[PDB]
Amino acid sequence: KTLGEVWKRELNLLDKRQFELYKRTDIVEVDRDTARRHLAEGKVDTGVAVSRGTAKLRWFHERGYVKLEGRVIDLGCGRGGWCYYAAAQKEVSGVKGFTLGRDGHEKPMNVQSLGWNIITFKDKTDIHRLEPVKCDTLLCDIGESSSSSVTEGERTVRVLDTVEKWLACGVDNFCVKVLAPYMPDVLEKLELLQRRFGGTVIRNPLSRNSTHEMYYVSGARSNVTFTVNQTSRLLMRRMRRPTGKVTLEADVILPIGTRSV
Numbered sequence: 704k705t706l707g708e709v710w711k712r713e714l715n716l717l718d719k720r721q722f723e724l725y726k727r728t729d730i731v732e733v734d735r736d737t738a739r740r741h742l743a744e745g746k747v748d749t750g751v752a753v754s755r756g757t758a759k760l761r762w763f764h765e766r767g768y769v770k771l772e773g774r775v776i777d778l779g780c781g782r783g784g785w786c787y788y789a790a791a792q793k794e795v796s797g798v799k800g801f802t803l804g805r806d807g808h809e810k811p812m813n814v815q816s817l818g819w820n821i822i823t824f825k826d827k828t829d830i831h832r833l834e835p836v837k838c839d840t841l842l843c844d845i846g847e848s849s850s851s852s853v854t855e856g857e858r859t860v861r862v863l864d865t866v867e868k869w870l871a872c873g874v875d876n877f878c879v880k881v882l883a884p885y886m887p888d889v890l891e892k893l894e895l896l897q898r899r900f901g902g903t904v905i906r907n908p909l910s911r912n913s914t915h916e917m918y919y920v921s922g923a924r925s926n927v928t929f930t931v932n933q934t935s936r937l938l939m940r941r942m943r944r945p946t947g948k949v950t951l952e953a954d955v956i957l958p959i960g961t962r963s964v
């Protein structure tokens with residue numbers, strides 16, 4: 704019954720064309736042309752990002768929504784866009800990335816952007832059953848979209864449930880994907896986590912309109928209900944006023960090489 708659930712219901716009423724127009728209405732995307740060509744050519748020393756994730760984390764990072772410091776852990780790293788971004792930051796001392804990388808799940812990608820050498824990738828790992836490790840910055844970008852709001856809610860509560868075990872070890876910084884912040888139970892878990900660890904949820908402008916995903920971050924504190932609804936209002940507005948107008952932005956190019964001495 705929340706505004707976001709109404710949004711989800713109306714999203715499912717869109718035919719294929721409607722959905723297509725909607726998905727790219729007033730959105731911002733990075734141009735992946737060059738990165739895709741370089742990766743396809745096997746170039747590992749041009750500093751291109753392995754995925755759209757690098758730009759998403761940079762957005763949070765550059766405006767203080769999440770500080771990237773010391774020991775970084777990246778749950779559900781996939782190709783590794785967040786790991787490579789974090790590894791290139793001077794304040795970061797190490798990066799441990801974990802992901803399934805099996806049964807259709809993408810495996811970490813090997814490139815040599817700055818600090819690749821301080822990253823330890825580990826695949827064939829289900830982070831829901833991985834024993835928490837002490838760290839300073841906790842990152843988690845997991846949440847598989849579903850036509851079912853019930854399912855998005857279940858997957859979202861499971862992620863927050865798992866992440867709470869890691870935050871309970873004591874972490875200074877965090878950035879965690881929240882697939883369905885519009886679901887009632889998720890909203891309440893977020894409110895409880897906020898009273899326990901602080902932070903709030905922020906909508907990344909690089910996220911597509913087809914998902915209501917927002918990120919639980921340590922760099923800001925605000926009323927969760929209000930801001931989740933603001934995003935709901937924006938998404939509903941774009942569905943009612945489709946245009947498919949997209950704004951392209953330069954993708955992230957990181958420096959290259961190992962961090963040594």
Ligand SMILES: Nc1ncnc2c1ncn2[C@@H]1O[C@H](CSCC[C@H](N)C(=O)O)[C@@H](O)[C@H]1O
Pocket residue numbers: 753754755756757778779780781782783784785786801802803804808809828829830831844845846
């Ligand atoms: N239970 C689990 N354990 C480990 N990894 C998981 C998982 N569930 C989902 N994942 C992985 O979480 C990843 C989310 S996509 C992450 C993109 C990454 N931030 C980047 O910048 O490239 C997917 O690769 C998915 O396979």
